[PDB]
Design a protein around this ligand. Structure first.
Ligand SMILES: [Mg+2]
Ligand SMILES: [Mg+2]
Ligand SMILES: [Mg+2]
Ligand SMILES: [Mg+2]
Ligand SMILES: [Mg+2]
Ligand SMILES: [Mg+2]
Ligand SMILES: [Mg+2]
Ligand SMILES: [Mg+2]
Ligand SMILES: [Mg+2]
Ligand SMILES: [Mg+2]
Ligand SMILES: [Mg+2]
Lengths: 214, 25, 127, 97, 197, 63, 91
RNA sequence: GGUGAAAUUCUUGGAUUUAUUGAAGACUAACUACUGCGAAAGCAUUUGCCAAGGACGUUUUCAUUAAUCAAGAACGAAAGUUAGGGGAUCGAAGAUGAUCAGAUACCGUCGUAGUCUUAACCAUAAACUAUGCCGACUAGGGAUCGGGUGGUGUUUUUUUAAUGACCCACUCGGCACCUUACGAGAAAUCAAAGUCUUUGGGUUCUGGGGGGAGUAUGGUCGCAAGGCUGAAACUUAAAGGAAUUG
RNA sequence: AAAAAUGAUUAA
């Protein structure tokens, strides 16, 4: 007999305070014993949590958020930002025919060494009183738009470091700034970043995450 | 018989003819 | 106030997987498939087998602690059919029968931007 | 004789398009020629919508959908009754209904 | 003479006595007369410079690599050969490299190498075409040419000797534990025959 | 043996290769909102009670 | 006039050693006896002394190169890799 | 795992299924259309560099410099050949499990060559619109791409500005569609396959009943595979196209 | 998406 489910500890997860309610959920690993036990084997965890779960607003039901466990004290797993991406059903909802898709991408680092790749998506818009059925762009508007996206995203990163990058990523204010900067070139339907991925990270920096948590 | 297989059979047969003339020359 | 887990229903053809893990996913709770309870070798993907597997999932889920789940429905994906098998709906059906609470249902089919030429040949699977 | 003015496909002006694979048999068929259908289906069946609504933490849940572009070869589309061979005069009708 | 790769002759100042010291390096591709070579821990990442393996990034191409620090070069010495730096382990002061034979190796990070690839590559791409060119090749190396086949000898001379036809007559795969005079053929062969059919 | 009882409220159609099976829509007597479709062997009218060994499957061979 | 149809410099070998071997030797001898631009003085004056040694008849610069050509493709890739790595380390 | 169903296969040496990564190679979904570009073959991630091109606008310039073209040339899918690199996937050969009367087929699991690339070859496809190229005229519409013109037009900026994006009316060029043929056609059908016994705008190429046969031979090109050019003897009353009824 | 080969000559 082994019955492995009787030697687990039921730890708890805490989000970083650049969100609403810190309660995420529960985890469990193994009994702490000799020979390099689970004091560190519980470190490398990533939790997928809905942004509506983290903010209590139903209209954030997409944009699922990564949270990476970085340090553990007591019965508490402190997590930091690890990435973001849209939900697949939301993506397939935006991507429809008789319109042009613009997908831009940048790789930039914040004030600290948080190098990270920001994506972005947009779709051309059928304006009012449009008899025309498709409303495609001219591949030069597309290039101009993608240039503006890259400029804006690089402007928003490498200043306003990761903590307040998340704090302004939550209310969807960046894509509004795209809406202002690109409304003169070509109308658009759905501007989003659609994904943030962290590439590599600096030294552990215990103070940053003890600053976020508490 | 299918035309492309007739062509393949003829090509093999022409290979054989060229080899037999190679024996004599 | 309810403890959450992840369902991770992989409903291919030829089989269905109901594979509950924690909210993170390194460790698992009661991975049971349709093929370990039907001896047909061909009913392994049947909705009945999937519903039985989900019931065994919930049976071992209780007295382990999970009470609600987020749902990740998966097809074979990649170059293959990328459509859910017949047992996925039944497995989710039975997980919701057995008292386990449901939230955040999503599809996790691996969808490729073209890669890895599909099997079957140029003329396809000729039947 | 020639069956269709657009031979069996939609290609007048380029010459080569690209091949896509049939979902059923993985037969290589040009994309302009493939029978393409949009499968937009609720992720849960109608027999389960009421149950998941009763068994959800989140009241008035979004009830997500699934989207899929299906590519069929001519043979699989006919065998699956996707296209259903038509009469000579009705063959010209392009209307989806 | 007898070496495919050319040799660079490099002059350094003696740090402790007033004089010059000649060193015979194996020349890397691109190194030219009148070029300045920089050797040391703080030397720059340029072709011809001599650096510790811990002072170069992964993917660096080096040559004349020391197996141990201070042995003055043992790996990737023949023409057109090089070592690829593939990783670092600063915890144990070690570096992983790929050798010309495809073998993976762990070396002290204090072992030195020369940035670049040994000059003279492509030499073996030219057929010799005739016995005399092999003759002149080996008269500058050693007395190993020409080679008589064992099966062309008598049994007194070779395990393959003898018989009323030329044939080996017993398996030519010889074990590791065979003794001197027995190791003629394919020693400790894991397999034989043409690879991939 | 948790044998359940169901009341047929709608007859859907006739299935099977030889047409020997009937599809019915049945609610339960304890709960009148737990409707399932079932496959029945013999002749069936409306307002009949079936005894089910198993009470979770959905009948196939629709439409 | 055209003295040979295809053997070129390998006409010195007559009919022996086989056509394929002679063609293989032909490509490398043409490379090996060719004159090359001097990267230092800008003149078509670089010739091979011995395998791997390339000397300019003016400015007398000698550079280590390939056995039968001044620069091999692998060597050019190595130079590009070293430049990329050095610039990455500096940036 | 896989199939009608199974078995070849892996599995307590933890297989399948999770999660954290890493490596390699190939490809570029959705957007993607009776849309675009290119002489054709073909061309779909972003950005930079290089040269090229059509159309449009033009009250710029030369002034017949043109059309089509034996000979002669460049390019030319896939497969295939030589050598180096690469070699994830899929997979002529092969292996192997099924099915079968037999299955050295279809189906399943593996898998060498290939698939990718560089330097060279090859020069063929239902390389098709099975419709040579240039020019003129003849019919009734709605769309769409690119350019240009105009507005008792609108629109996010100034709540009344170039612009960009839509609307309306035109126009030139293009991919194409819908109706009907007045016309043509053996018909299928065709806005050209019309302006044809009321037969002549210019010009290139090809065919002359079915087979033998794209064979034989000669020449020429290719490393080869083979390509290009290309008969005759003999044989035979049909072969063939479109449509009708069953 | 189980298996399913064959049918002498003339005779409108
Ligand atoms: Mg069929
Ligand atoms: Mg027909
Ligand atoms: Mg083509
Ligand atoms: Mg010998
Ligand atoms: Mg003898
Ligand atoms: Mg012996
Ligand atoms: Mg386009
Ligand atoms: Mg065609
Ligand atoms: Mg033709
Ligand atoms: Mg066009
Ligand atoms: Mg004739």
């Amino acid at each position: 007999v082994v019955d492995p489910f009787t030697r687990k500890e039921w730890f708890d997860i805490k989000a970083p305070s650049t969100f609403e309610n810190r309660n995420v959920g529960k985890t469990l690993v193994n009994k702490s014993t000799g020979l390099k036990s689970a004091s560190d084997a519980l470190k490398g965890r990533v939790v997928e949590v809905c942004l509506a779960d983290l903010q209590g607003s139903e209209d954030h039901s997409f944009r699922k958020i990564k949270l990476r466990v970085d340090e553990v004290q007591g019965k508490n797993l402190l997590t930091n930002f690890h990435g973001m991406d849209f939900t697949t059903d939301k993506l397939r909802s935006m991507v429809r025919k008789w319109q042009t898709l613009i997908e831009a991408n940048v790789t930039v680092k914040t004030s600290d060494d948080y190098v990270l790749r920001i994506f972005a998506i947009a779709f051309t818009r059928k304006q009012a009183n449009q008899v025309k059925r498709h409303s495609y762009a001219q591949s030069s508007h597309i290039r101009a738009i993608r240039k503006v996206i890259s400029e804006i995203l690089t402007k928003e990163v490498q200043g306003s470091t990761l903590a307040q990058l998340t704090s302004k990523l939550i209310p969807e204010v960046i894509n509004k700034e795209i809406e202002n900067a690109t409304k003169d070139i070509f109308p658009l339907q759905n501007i989003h970043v659609r994904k943030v991925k962290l590439l590599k990270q600096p030294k552990f920096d215990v103070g940053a995450l003890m600053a976020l948590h508490g | 018989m299918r035309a492309k297989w007739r062509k393949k059979r003829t090509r093999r047969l022409k290979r054989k003819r060229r080899k037999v003339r190679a024996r004599s020359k | 106030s309810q403890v959450f887990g992840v369902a991770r229903i992989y409903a291919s053809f030829n089989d269905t997987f109901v594979h509950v893990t924690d909210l993170s996913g390194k460790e698992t709770i009661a991975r049971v498939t349709g093929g370990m309870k039907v001896k047909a070798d061909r009913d392994e993907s049947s909705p009945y087998a999937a519903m039985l597997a989900a019931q065994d999932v919930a049976a071992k889920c209780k007295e382990v602690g999970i009470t609600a789940v987020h749902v990740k429905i998966r097809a074979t994906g990649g170059t293959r059919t990328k459509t859910p098998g017949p047992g996925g709906q039944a497995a989710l059906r039975a997980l919701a029968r057995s008292g386990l609470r449901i939230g955040r249902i999503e599809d996790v089919t691996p969808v490729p931007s073209d890669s890895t030429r599909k099997k079957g040949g140029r003329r396809g699977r000729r039947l | 004789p020639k069956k269709r003015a657009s031979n069996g496909r939609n290609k007048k002006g380029r010459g080569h398009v690209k091949p896509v694979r049939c979902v059923n048999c993985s037969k290589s068929i040009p994309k302009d020629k493939a029978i393409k259908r949009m499968a937009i289906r609720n992720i849960v069946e109608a027999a389960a919508v009421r149950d998941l609504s009763e068994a959800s933490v989140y009241p008035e849940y979004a009830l997500p959908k699934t989207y899929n572009k299906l590519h069929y070869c001519v043979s699989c589309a006919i065998h699956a009754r996707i296209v259903r061979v038509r009469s000579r005069e009705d063959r010209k009708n392009r209307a989806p209904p | 003479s007898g070496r495919g790769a050319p040799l660079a002759k490099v002059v350094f100042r003696d740090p402790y006595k007033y004089r010059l010291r000649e060193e015979i390096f194996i020349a890397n591709e691109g190194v030219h007369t009148g070029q300045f070579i920089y050797a040391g821990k703080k030397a720059s990442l340029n072709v011809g410079n001599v650096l510790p393996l811990g002072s170069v990034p992964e993917g660096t191409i080096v040559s004349n690599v020391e197996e141990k620090p201070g042995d003055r070069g043992a790996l990737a010495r023949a023409s057109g050969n090089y070592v690829i730096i593939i990783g670092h382990n600063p915890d144990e002061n070690k570096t992983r490299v790929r050798l010309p034979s495809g073998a993976k190796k762990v070396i002290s990070s204090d072992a030195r190498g020369v940035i670049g690839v040994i000059a003279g590559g492509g030499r073996v791409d030219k057929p010799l075409l005739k016995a005399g060119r092999a003759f002149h090749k080996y008269r500058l190396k050693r007395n190993s040419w020409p080679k008589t086949r064992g099966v062309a000898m008598n049994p007194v001379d070779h395990p393959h000797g003898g018989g009323n036809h030329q044939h080996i007559g017993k398996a030519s795969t010889i074990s590791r534990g065979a003794v001197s005079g027995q190791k003629a053929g394919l020693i400790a062969a894991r397999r034989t025959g043409l690879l991939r059919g | 043996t948790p044998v359940t009882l169901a009341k047929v409220i709608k007859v859907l159609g006739r299935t099977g290769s030889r047409g020997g099976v009937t599809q019915v829509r049945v609610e339960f007597l304890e709960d009148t909102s737990r409707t399932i479709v079932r496959n029945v062997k013999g002749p069936v009218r409306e307002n009949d009670i079936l005894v089910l060994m198993e009470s979770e499957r959905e009948a196939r061979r629709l439409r | 006039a055209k003295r040979t149809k295809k053997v070129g410099i390998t006409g010195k070998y007559g009919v022996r050693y086989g056509s394929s071997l002679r063609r293989q030797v032909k490509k490398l001898e043409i490379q090996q006896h060719a004159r090359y631009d001097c990267s230092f003085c800008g003149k078509k004056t670089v010739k091979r002394g011995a395998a791997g040694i390339w000397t300019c008849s003016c400015c007398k610069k000698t550079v280590a190169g390939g056995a039968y050509t001044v620069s091999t493709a692998a060597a050019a890739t190595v130079r590009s890799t070293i430049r990329r790595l050095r610039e990455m380390v500096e940036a």
